[PDB]
From Swiss-Prot:
Purpose: Exerts a potent antimicrobial activity against Gram-negative and Gram-positive bacteria, including methicillin-resistant Staphylococcus aureus, and fungi.
Protein name: Cathelicidin-6
Subcellular location: Secreted
Lineage: superkingdom: Eukaryota
Whole-protein coverage range: 132 to 157 of 158
Family: Belongs to the cathelicidin family.
């Protein structure tokens, strides 16, 4: 893909920002 696959890559960085807490994300 292109911009779509790129989004998934950037999301991986955003995940690192959260303290492994699915609560703040949900």
């Amino acid at each position: 893909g292109r911009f779509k696959r790129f989004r998934k890559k950037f999301k991986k960085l955003f995940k690192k920002l959260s303290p492994v807490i699915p609560l703040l994300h949900l």
